[PDB]
Symmetry: D3
Subunit: 253 residues, 6 copies
């Protein structure tokens, strides 16, 4: 049931995918998170204490969950992507995608030659140790590549990036984008808001779905109205912090 990648297809079909970020970096809470019904969960390897050692336990925790696991790599480089592919990730979120070349490299990092440069191994979690049918051929067509536009250069080259073959979705990272535009900590600033819609619009111009992280409901709904389809509406860490604080406050004397 590994292939076809249902998430990748849903995205292409322009269907709304509701997601949740994951930074708690442990299999116990992540197993619980997998019961919520989110369409996709982002195991953050860039801003959370996640790595191969924590990723496998969480992927195992998510076995049976309807949620599509997505790894947000620490950076766009071929080696860590090679390693994350074999441990079982079929969907990737690439931070700071600033040029056409970088978008091409990200895609190539997930495809075996001649299409890409992915290193070959005959047995691992990805092909469930040789039990995944026609693995080598099917893998090349079933990896989701979501590139993050969150820098001025990325915005400048958004068209070339979105036009890149293999780039399945254009994702806006609000915090870094805001910082890039001189508005650190203030993504709601008008100029950042304009940049966001511009990114969504250019994604659409190239037939690629757009996405974003929006933990504030009002923002998430506005982005959805603007045409975004794969929207992360919060994070396990954020809801845990908020919910635990609220419970304590409710009884505060």
């Amino acid at each position: 049931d590994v292939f076809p990648n249902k998430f990748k297809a849903a995205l292409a079909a322009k269907q709304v995918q509701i997601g949740c970020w994951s930074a708690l970096s442990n299999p116990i809470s992540t197993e619980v998170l997998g019961l919520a019904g989110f369409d996709w969960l982002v195991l953050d390897g860039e801003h959370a204490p996640n790595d191969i050692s924590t990723f496998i336990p969480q992927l195992m925790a998510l076995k049976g969950s309807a949620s599509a696991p997505v790894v947000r790599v620490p950076t766009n480089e071929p080696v860590i992507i090679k390693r994350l592919l074999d441990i079982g990730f079929y969907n990737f979120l690439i931070p700071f995608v600033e040029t056409k070349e970088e978008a091409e490299l990200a895609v190539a990092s997930t495809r075996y030659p001649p299409e890409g440069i992915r290193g070959v191994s005959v047995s691992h979690r990805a092909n469930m140790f040789g039990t995944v049918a026609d693995y080598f051929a099917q893998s090349n067509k079933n990896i989701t590549i979501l590139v993050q536009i969150e820098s001025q250069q990325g915005v400048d080259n958004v068209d070339a990036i979105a036009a890149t073959e293999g780039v399945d979705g254009i994702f806006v990272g609000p915090s870094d984008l805001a910082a890039a535009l001189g508005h650190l900590g203030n993504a709601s600033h008008p100029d950042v808001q304009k940049a966001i819609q511009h990114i969504f619009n250019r994604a659409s111009a190239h037939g690629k779905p757009s996405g974003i992280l929006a933990p504030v409901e009002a923002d998430a709904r506005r982005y959805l109205e603007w045409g975004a389809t794969f929207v992360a509406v919060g994070s396990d860490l954020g809801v845990f912090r908020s919910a635990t604080q609220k419970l304590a406050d409710t009884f505060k004397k």
Copy 2:
């Protein structure tokens, strides 16, 4: 700093202490939990996958937190209590205390001879490796013992148990008490509610504060009105499960 035990003092003063249960068994989420402001947190070793290997990481995660760490032991026996004391626990929740003798044994398990049977070690987290002043003497007077009345025999012997020297609080375990009274999964049944009130009354009669676990706000508020002072109003697990499901439902209905 370690001593005097403020939590123990707060209980003796019959001051309200709002707590939260912990079963996520990992230092990452627990550090966040420590920011909530709960007066006490129960690291569950009876019904959650916690053990000494997970307890120390979480105790370290809670260093600096205003929340008093309390360990709920897997069972009332000397050995594990001996080990939990040395790793840094100064507050204990003892499950299934059904007789005066069992109450006395729990207390004795936390005190050095001649008062108790606690094994002696000269350096460990508890005396912060020899840096806690007058440790041996002060330790015996600074351990909190909270006994759980959650069985028919426990209810029958509640007076002798509450009258036991060293028993700092009388805690009601709703689920086991309900089951013991023939109402598994129905702690709201009048038979159970009546026993709870009775337990609270007898704790008061012997000058000991009473407590209970009540994840439903209405229940927690009723128990507080009845006079319980150390009330756990939820769990990190319950809060996490509910909050994540809620976020998903908000967008997926």
Copy 3:
């Protein structure tokens, strides 16, 4: 999905169940082991370095596997069984069951009151954090109890043990039985073989299936012919040791 317990049903139907022991105590190899197709896998907590900290990772590794996970507890006592139940084990192998009383205690340790003495918790892996329907009621009828007859007293009391309500299967532990009969390391001795057949006969007399661990194919096949139905035919450790040595020998003689 969790209930009804198919393994328990298969045993009641006297259907053959081929199992494999597990002592490698890690999620990496165990996930691979789950692909083999064994009807049941025994995560050994008595003679292998397994504990709750290693059990959950392996249970997660086995999610989706057709193999029924069975835990062989370190000893027949209430507390550890209580803890193993909540982390997600629905099938148990109990070592050294020597009397009717011990058999009854093992069964009781897995059932909530009034039928048993199992401690109650409202959320854990066992009820998949509150998502298992009618959990409390169904759990009591869906736990498999396999008792090990591996001592002289166990043999003497095999009838009373097999007649005990809740005892789902009569399992022979070859090594301990051989030692108990004065033939340490020689389970093939006629004295031992005779006791095994006798045990199988008495299990059948009380309508309970019998089982045994037999890493030698000829032995396993003989025991199956004698009528044993849940037979462990090897271990991940034994298989690994043998296969790796064999590969090396093929080239180094």
Copy 4:
């Protein structure tokens, strides 16, 4: 290589064995500790955060070290001893041995039937997965049992305990003995010193070597003069705490 047990032989010969306690509970520092040249190292499972999960890593860290690994069990009970034996421990320190019966039980817990009650497993670290020659037979004669006399009853019954077959050494636990004699934290009190000498004398009377833990050089040297042969002269924790504080003080006064 595994057998014969050289440490056990050294004790029988009444040869001095200098040991060091270990509580740092991790393989990194323990590997370094194994380079020190101590005759024996005690991996403390009673007063340090050690358990099977930390024991195997440290045993592996000590492979090749001339130091004999000794585990100090959390308590004198059959089950944990059974488990510690299989993971690779051949030398045991038993806390609170107070009667002849308890001494006999500790010994029996390490020997296979008919001599003892040790559970049988055909492959584990102890027999290095089936590579230790004549394992079953040799194991029964190669386990070291060191009993701790550290309670008033233990002192009263020291003769019967020392006379017990299988008891290889009589070890004095200073801290618990002092506490038992009403001198908590004052093992130097004459009452305690007198009991120690008496214990040493009775061990000698029954042809068994005596030992003790003495982190203060003057104390260790006095005990050696009195006739103790297996003396732990410190702990990795005590040495580390002292040495690091000393280095800091050298520059900060």
Copy 5:
């Protein structure tokens, strides 16, 4: 109490800071190390088995310690620095800083745009999950950057490096410097000694404090006399090795 960074200020004030290296890579011994009173502790990620998985446990172990935690990164590259910042490190030691450009990149790696290129996340250990006041603004002014001059190129460009804005301290790595000058294993060679004082002197010429690692007391004091202020006087590993060996030797027969 996260900001202001007291260590960073102390350094700027030219106050002597006594430090200790840490390579034991575990929270147990590191918690003990934090009680010694060192002004700073270097959790080595370049030559010790430390990484994100070991760093968080040790940072938690150091909560409450007066010692300022400093991470010595594996190499000077933006990605690992990004990750180490979010896990809670506010002080960095950068190995092999050989050019002005590299010094600039190291500084920029720790500052949010427009000042630097640090990736943005709204919740993590660094801002204690949103509880650190005015975090985004304050963080950019509270990160300590200590660059290592330990290569011939670094020596050649020491002036440009020390003149770089954001470079708070010039640290000499003796072992690599010695090797670079053709004196591997002999930092005491006259030419290496001259290079060291030259580095200290150029640091001073640009108003930046100088530092070095000197486990031999005589060397540490000489360097202090030469004007160095942040001097690491040993390591947890070195003192442990020395102290354990000395204890054993003291009793060697």
Copy 6:
């Protein structure tokens, strides 16, 4: 006994070395794997979930094994090699070695200046914390460098690569080579077979031994006949998968 490197010498002597790949990434099974008698074991860090955290436990597990540990790095870059050297690896397998420059960099990454660029540390597992005699000098001559030729560029430059000083062996990675030649998943294709023998032949032309991974016996023997000497004949993962599946199939009804 660390130096001289016996494996490195055996290779130079053109002696056949039978190896086995390791991807199970845990110390339990790897300790067992070390008993098989393979001449070398490759702890895979490129296609298996291995890293520093898993490498040290496995190296400790292999202490006492006659098998030479070899790490296959995730990629050819100086930083991870620096780190792997200090943790105790003396033999390296470098993936995708495509040019003379890259071969030179790999060699240099393992040698201290002036020969190479290896970073210097005075105490770590590699010099067993200062106990390895004449370490600094001997290390530079005792590291085995095995470069992988598994790309078209590597084949084109095989002569320059094999001629590089310090390159001890030319290893063919079949899967990547096949993919590079347009035959993904089909290394048996005639053109790949020709490329393999060509690589072996060019290795010989420069006096360097050749090696390859060949899990199919017929292939391994053919390669040996072609002149290859360090041949990996399988993997722990592959044999485990095959052997466990076979055992289950043997009894399948």
